[PDB]
């Protein structure tokens, strides 16, 4: 009855070089006859390159003078700069000495007793500097790389906007936090610590030829920054009634901003140079350039108006006059390190060849396998 009724009632994986782990490949086994030539190739030509770099680096001649002690050490009469303040490097003339001179011309009209007057610096160059002469300024011990300092500016104000107070003060990440607005309630136009503390010394638009003043060497503040930077820096759209100068720019703008005097930060390449803070403790920024004429051998004078204080923090400020290299200034590191690398490669090649000629084994030895020995 019920029992009778109950009685009555592919995956093969794809064969493929990829899925079967059989891709086309080389298996590099390193043997001395392939490794030692590589070592020698690297050695030989890292030595070529290091020698060429060191050779082209010796040709770099430069002038450095730290004038931070000009108000107190210099006098009203021409006096040699102490040896600790200058460094000359001329490669045709390795025994120069010929100390530079400086003179302090005080300005009692100015009431900033910390930095005032003009430092006149006379230096003699025995050689010519190429047709592309850079007058940089150096700062020592000014820290432009601290956490709050380095984020203290408005990108909205750099980009030409008439940024609100909240846009300027309460922006995520970078914002000009301690310096966004003055006690009256006007927004600082270049807000932030970076713009406030802009280097202030006035550099001349020429090098006075002390011998023949009929031909003075001319310098420019145009072309001292990348030109593409004018795509990022824009002339502001503020209205001179919304903005005020930074706190430390108030000797520059005693009345404040008004109709004509607002700075054009697009044309102001010193401002754009300062707004790029230095990564390290020594800060070099281009301030003057001559792309036309060679600076012939002779004695020149540089008159710097002193407005920026450094002696509070034992800092230094100086001038650095160069023509440069393709690798930058004069720095022997790259050549020394290319030569060291070539010599280390050659030494390892020789050491391995020596260890091979004496304790060199046989290559394809199934007898040296761990199990065939034990």
């Amino acid at each position: 009855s019920e029992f009778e009724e109950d009685e009555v009632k592919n995956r093969r994986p794809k064969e493929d070089a990829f899925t079967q782990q059989r891709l086309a490949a080389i298996n590099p086994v390193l043997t001395p006859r392939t490794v030692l030539p590589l070592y020698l190739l690297i050695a030989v030509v890292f030595v070529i390159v290091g020698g060429c770099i060191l050779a082209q680096n010796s040709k770099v001649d430069e002038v450095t003078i730290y004038y931070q002690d000009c108000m107190t050490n210099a006098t009203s009469s021409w006096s040699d700069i102490p040896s600790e303040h200058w460094q000359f490097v001329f490669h045709k003339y390795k025994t120069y000495n010929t100390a530079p001179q400086w003179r302090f011309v005080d300005d009692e009209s100015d009431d900033f007793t910390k930095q005032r007057g003009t430092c006149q610096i006379r230096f003699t160059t025995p050689s010519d500097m190429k047709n592309n002469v850079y007058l940089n300024y150096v700062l020592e011990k000014f820290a432009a790389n601290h956490r709050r300092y380095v984020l203290s500016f408005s990108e909205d104000q750099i980009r030409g906007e008439d940024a609100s107070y909240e846009t300027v003060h309460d922006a995520t990440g970078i914002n000009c936090k301690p310096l966004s607005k003055n006690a009256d309630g006007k927004i600082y136009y270049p807000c932030g610590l970076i713009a406030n503390s802009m280097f202030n010394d006035t550099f001349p638009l020429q090098l006075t030829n002390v011998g023949d003043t009929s031909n003075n060497y001319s310098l420019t503040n145009k072309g001292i920054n990348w030109e593409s930077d004018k795509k990022r820096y824009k002339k502001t759209k503020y209205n001179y009634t919304q903005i005020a100068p930074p706190p430390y720019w108030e000797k520059m703008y005693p009345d404040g901003y008004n109709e004509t005097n607002i700075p054009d930060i697009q044309d102001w390449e010193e401002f754009q140079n300062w707004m790029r803070p230095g990564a390290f403790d020594k800060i070099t920024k281009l301030i003057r350039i001559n792309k036309n004429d060679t600076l012939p051998a002779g004695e020149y004078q540089l008159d710097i108006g002193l407005h920026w204080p450094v002696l509070e923090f034992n800092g230094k400020k100086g001038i650095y006059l160069t023509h440069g290299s393709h690798l930058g200034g004069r720095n022997p590191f790259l050549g020394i390190v290319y030569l060291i690398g070539g010599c280390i490669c050659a030494a390892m090649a020789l050491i391995l060849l020596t260890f091979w000629l004496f304790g060199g084994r046989k290559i394809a030895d199934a007898s040296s396998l761990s199990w065939n020995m034990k």
């Binding site: 995956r11 601290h146 923090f313 290319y338 690398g341 490669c345």
Partner: protein, 1178 residues
């Protein structure tokens, strides 16, 4: 815990919980093999993820930042990477567990037949013919999950049993039933279950509907050999209780399969987790690979380095903020603030945020990607796919592939994994003449060890055997027309046998052979039933497969066993049928090791007592007067030979009995059989009377066929250094037979048996657990010099070399109970098996298999692998570092509850060796490398702190800090972790000794991790201080003289050096340089340059607005670039060359041999374990 089950009866008042619902609830009949429950997936998975310490670090950083905010802030996008990575890992784990769920569902939806029309009260004579019959009562098709305690179930032939049920009645009158228990133990025999005597007369749904009863049972106790219950009903003539005791003999368990039975009817007692197989199973653990735990320790070392950096940063920053004459007092509006210690505290926690990257967020997602891809490449392997089952190697667990590279011990189930369940009559010795040609793979391996080139020898011998076989079949057909002769199933290959059965060796040999085959066709318990498809075909239904093999050979040679009359059997001899008359049958017994039949020989007729039994049992019952005493020694020699070849052997002896003798023995046996009070020993003494005299006429030899390539795979894994222990639930003798075939056990090898036997109980001690201890200590002191002591186990942990000495341990389950009981004897047992190249634990329960794996795993901290089919190996397999299930034609719980599932045992080698080696290596190289690469980048932030007074400005632009680990340096290390091969798969199977490295754990340590950390530290120094030393003199690094001073531009210098150094380092530590990984290395470097270009060209990056143009146009950048990459890569490359040249590793030597063509004669996909294997030149 006693549970009463009422059928067709209302539950008593005390058993109901007040609302028509019984108190006791019984678990659903559903099986669960998933790691997680649907409601426990998220807590458990997130906890598993947060057992990685770097995840707790990431969580802590975000939490701390958000409540406090402090420096940097910008919360919202800070918590996103961790949440995304945790969600993605949870999704991967859920997809894995969903595959397991699909298999569970398939098992749960299996069909059963459950009685309908009678309400199951338990879960929301005896039969009364007077009660009205209900037609709606029928056995309805249902699912396995629909089965509940108290349901009446009807199981058809070859139907798997859905729950633990008690047999009520079977289609056979008297209620006998056969079950296949290969799943619950290793038994190859069918087990006879018996139905209860009272319910035997019930064989319809209607009778079972009119019936009432209730069973009082004990609870579920996970002892496969014990059950105790009591069925109680009321007599329908007289109202009173009648009780029937239920043994394990009446019970069908969930793992078994009904066999040779039309149907079997029973009542369910246990369901789901209450069944004995599920009580042995366990709950499918979440396995973490070994390298992952060691990775936790590596991450902690990285935490310590980060703490030291942040401590230095905070202290130096406080010391600086205490100073005077600083530009911050003039230009930053800076004031010296009180509590310089709390300012050092703020600086510490600013530095923690600065140096976050030191612990990389991409580490765990990268390891998970690599492991998932490794599992996918295992699954996509075509040499791991079994065409016959249509089954690829399926990874069940997608994170433990590198465990397969470190395996030292393989624990193997003997039946159904090592062996295919096929028995073949191979050889037979008749009158001291051996017949049968056989060429195993075991003999091929022995002879290969001997030296003989066994490719040519084996193929030639197989051709000889096939030719002899065809000759034999044609000569058989010509000898006579046999109705049941089917040549497609012949396994006896003796040409000489049939060529001798006519005339060859003389008429005495003629008659000896004929009578031997006739006695094989007479003395047996095989049943013949017509094939369903072919009416003329017979199917030879037998309880023992060896008996079926013997009768099948007797049929093929021309002594066919057909049908069964009321008396005797009809045997077709050479095509002429004659029925015999069976006087008596003395059944086979586990206690007798012998079967016997008595036949009538016509005249005054005579009796013929034919006795079939084990070689020693029969040899003991033999005549001194008569036996040729030459046939005796020849037969013993043949049987020893056969047993060495791994064949189970029997002897057969006939005694001719005078009529007088048989009348007396028949009547004595009749009294003994009618006698009550344990008639068993009555029949024992009477059968002992009759059988003590016998004339040995011959012996047989049946092979239990192993799977293909099992001795080859075992020898490969032994050359790799892996020890194989065989744990069986089957008898010792079968395990020893299998061992010889496997080549695990050879002649000239000592068998250390840990017998707890009474006769040697007389010798060693008083009673067991003293005698197991005595035997362990005696073997330990005798054959080796060491005893079980903590220092000896300590010293044994140190050496992983394969054991020498030619000893093999043989323990049964009784002795293993004692040897695993106490800690000191556990030490002694582990030490005796740590030597002793072969270990066979026979007659062992699933709990004991798991216990042995755990003993080897805990003592001797080592990687283990368990492989098997069935529910014993479920417990063995879950408690192992890698559990492997072997897949069959039907669903298996060992396959469901495993990590990998292969179609054949033979894949172990190819899968285990190739994949294991690649994974162990791929992960090893990948994980220090990761920590190396990240480290370079991150450490430059710390070096920049030396110059910013540890204040906390960043050297890097923020897009660099995300795209370094996301895009610039991720893919090289990931593809090294997924696609790296040191040698190809052919060499991995040709040189299995390359595996030993993973056993020794040479590839991965914390020493190598610290060396990579030191290299990353050195290279971070180079990457930061070479750009710094290019800047430091005058800060002018450009030809034009324009400024490149911004820290983001120095960071571009640093970052380009770090990326190209990192990627070239990763490429140099790759063994194989394929077009794919190389393409993506080149792309990673190009991507750093291309991102700088694309991002800079935009006004969106405010201070990085032209970093690409200005920096990549500078010859300074390229000068430092080349020399810094040289100085970063040179020390390590020089170390690697000095190492390859003077202290090469074995893989280095093997790759040199590879380049010189030592492996050029091997085909690309080369399986040395494959039987259909193309001959290799040398």
């Amino acid at each position: 815990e006693l549970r009463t089950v009422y059928y067709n009866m209302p539950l008593p008042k005390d058993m109901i919980d007040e609302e028509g619902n019984p108190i006791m609830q019984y678990p659903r009949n559903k099986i669960r093999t998933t790691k997680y429950t649907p409601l426990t997936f998220l807590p458990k998975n997130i906890l598993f993820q947060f057992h990685n310490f770097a995840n707790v670090y990431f969580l802590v950083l975000i939490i701390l930042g958000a409540f406090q905010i402090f420096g940097v802030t910008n919360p919202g996008l800070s918590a996103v990477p961790l949440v995304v990575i945790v969600i993605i890992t949870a999704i991967k784990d859920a997809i894995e567990d969903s595959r397991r769920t699909v298999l569970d569902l398939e098992v749960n939806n299996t069909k059963t037949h459950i009685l309908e029309g009678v309400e199951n009260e338990n879960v929301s004579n005896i039969v009364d013919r007077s009660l009205p019959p209900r037609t709606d009562c029928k056995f309805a098709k249902n699912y396995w999950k629909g089965v509940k305690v108290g349901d009446i179930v009807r199981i058809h032939n070859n139907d798997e049993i859905p729950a633990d049920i008690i047999l009520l009645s079977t289609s056979d009158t008297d209620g006998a039933c056969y079950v296949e228990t290969k799943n619950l133990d290793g038994e190859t025999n069918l087990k006879v279950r018996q139905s209860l005597k009272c319910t035997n007369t019930i064989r319809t749904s209607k009778d079972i509907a009119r019936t009432k009863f209730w069973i009082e049972s004990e609870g579920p106790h996970s002892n496969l050999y014990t059950y105790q219950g009591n069925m109680k009903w009321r007599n329908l003539a007289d109202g009173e209780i009648r009780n029937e005791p239920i043994t394990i003999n009446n019970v069908l368990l969930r793992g078994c399969t009904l066999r040779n039975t039309k149907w079997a009817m029973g009542v369910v007692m246990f369901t789901g987790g209450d069944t004995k197989i599920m009580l042995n199973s366990g709950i499918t653990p979440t396995k973490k690979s070994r390298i992952s735990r060691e990775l936790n320790f590596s991450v902690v070392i990285n935490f310590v380095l980060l703490f030291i950096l942040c401590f230095v940063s905070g202290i130096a920053n406080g010391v600086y903020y205490d100073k005077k004459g600083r530009s911050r007092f003039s230009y930053e509006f800076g004031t010296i603030a009180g509590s310089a210690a709390t300012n050092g505290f703020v600086s510490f926690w600013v530095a923690v945020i600065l140096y976050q990257s030191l612990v990389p967020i991409s580490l765990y997602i990268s390891v998970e990607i690599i492991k998932t891809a490794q599992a996918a490449f295992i699954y996509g392997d075509v040499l791991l796919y079994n065409a016959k089952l249509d089954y690829p190697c399926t990874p069940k667990s997608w994170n433990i592939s590198d465990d397969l590279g470190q395996v030292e011990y393989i624990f193997s189930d003997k039946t159904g994994t090592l062996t295919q369940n096929v028995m073949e009559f191979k050889k037979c010795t008749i009158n001291g003449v051996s017949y049968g040609r056989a060429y195993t793979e075991a003999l091929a391996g022995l002879r290969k060890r001997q030296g003989i080139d066994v490719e040519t020898e084996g193929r030639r011998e197989k051709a000889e055997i096939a030719k002899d076989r065809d000759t034999m079949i044609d000569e058989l057909r010509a000898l006579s027309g046999n109705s049941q002769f089917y040549p497609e199933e012949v396994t006896f290959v003796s040409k000489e046998f049939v060529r001798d059965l006519k005339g060859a060796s003389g008429e005495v040999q003629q008659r000896c052979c004929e009578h031997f085959m006739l006695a094989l066709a007479l003395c047996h318990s095989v049943l013949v039933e017509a094939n369903p498809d072919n009416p003329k075909k017979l199917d030879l239904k037998a309880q023992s497969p060896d008996e079926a093999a013997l009768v099948a050979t007797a049929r093929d040679v021309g002594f066919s066993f057909v049908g069964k009359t009321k008396k005797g059997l009809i045997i077709e001899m050479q095509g002429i049928q004659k029925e015999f008359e069976i006087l008596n049958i003395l059944e086979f017994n586990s206690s007798r090791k012998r079967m016997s039949c008595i036949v009538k020989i016509p005249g005054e007729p005579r009796a013929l007592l034919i006795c079939k039994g084990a070689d020693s049992i029969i040899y003991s019952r033999l005549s001194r007067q008569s036996n040729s005493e030459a046939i005796l020694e020849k037969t013993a020699l043949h049987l020893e030979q056969y047993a060495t070849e791994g064949l189970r052997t029997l002897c057969i002896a006939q005694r001719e009995l005078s009529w007088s003798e048989y009348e007396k023995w028949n009547e004595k046996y009749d009294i003994a059989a009618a006698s009550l009070a344990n008639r068993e020993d009555e029949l024992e003494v009477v059968a002992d009377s009759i059988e003590r005299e016998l004339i040995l006429l011959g012996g047989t030899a049946i092979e239990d066929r192993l799977q293909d390539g099992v001795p080859d795979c075992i020898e490969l894994l032994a050359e790799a250094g892996i020890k194989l222990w065989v744990l069986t639930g089957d008898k010792v003798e079968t395990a020893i037979n299998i061992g010889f075939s496997c080549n695990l056990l050879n002649n000239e090898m000592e068998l250390l048996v840990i017998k707890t036997t009474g006769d040697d109980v007389k010798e060693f001690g008083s009673e067991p657990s003293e005698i197991v201890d005595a035997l362990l200590s005696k073997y330990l002191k005798e054959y080796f010099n060491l005893t079980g002591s903590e220092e000896e186990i300590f010293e044994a942990k140190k050496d992983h070399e394969f054991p020498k000495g030619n000893y093999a341990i043989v323990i049964d389950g009784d002795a293993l109970k004692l040897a695993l009981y106490g800690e000191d004897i556990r030490r002694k047992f582990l030490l005796l098996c740590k030597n002793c190249r072969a270990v066979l634990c026979c007659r062992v329960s699933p709990s004991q298999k798991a216990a042995v794996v755990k003993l080897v795993k805990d003592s001797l901290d080592v990687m283990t692998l368990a492989i098997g089919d069935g529910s014993n190996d479920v417990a063995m397999i879950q408690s192992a570092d890698v559990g492997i299930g072997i897949a069959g034609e039907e669903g298996r719980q060992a396959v469901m509850c495993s990590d990998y599932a292969i179609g054949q045992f033979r894949y172990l080698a190819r899968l285990v060796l190739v994949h294991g080696r690649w994974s162990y290596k791929r992960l090893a190289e990948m994980i220090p490398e990761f920590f190396y690469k990240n480290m370079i980048f991150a450490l430059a932030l710390f070096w920049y702190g030396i110059y910013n007074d540890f204040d906390g400005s960043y050297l890097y632009e923020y897009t660099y800090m995300m795209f370094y680990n996301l895009a610039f340096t991720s893919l090289p290390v990931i593809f090294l972790g997924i696609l790296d091969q040191d040698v190809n798969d052919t060499i991995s199977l040709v040189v299995p000794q390359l595996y030993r490295v993973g056993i020794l754990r040479k590839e991965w340590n914390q020493r190598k991790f610290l060396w990579y950390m030191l290299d990353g530290l050195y290279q971070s120094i180079i990457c930061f201080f070479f750009p710094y030393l290019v800047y430091h003199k005058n800060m002018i690094v450009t030809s034009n003289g324009l400024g490149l001073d911004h820290r983001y531009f120095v960071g571009v210098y640093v970052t380009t050096i770090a990326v190209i150094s990192c990627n070239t380092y990763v490429l140099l530590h790759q063994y194989r340089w394929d077009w794919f990984s190389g393409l993506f290395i080149a792309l990673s470097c190009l991507v750093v340059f291309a991102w700088t270009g694309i991002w800079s060209s935009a006004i969106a990056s405010r201070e990085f607005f032209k970093a690409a143009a200005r920096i990549y146009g500078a010859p300074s950048f390229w000068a430092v670039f080349f020399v810094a990459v040289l100085f970063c890569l040179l020390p390590r490359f020089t170390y690697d060359s000095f190492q390859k040249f003077f202290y090469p590793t074995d893989v280095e030597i093997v790759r040199e041999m590879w380049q010189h063509g030592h492996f050029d004669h091997y085909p690309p996909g080369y399986d040395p374990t494959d039987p259909n294997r193309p001959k290799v030149t040398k």
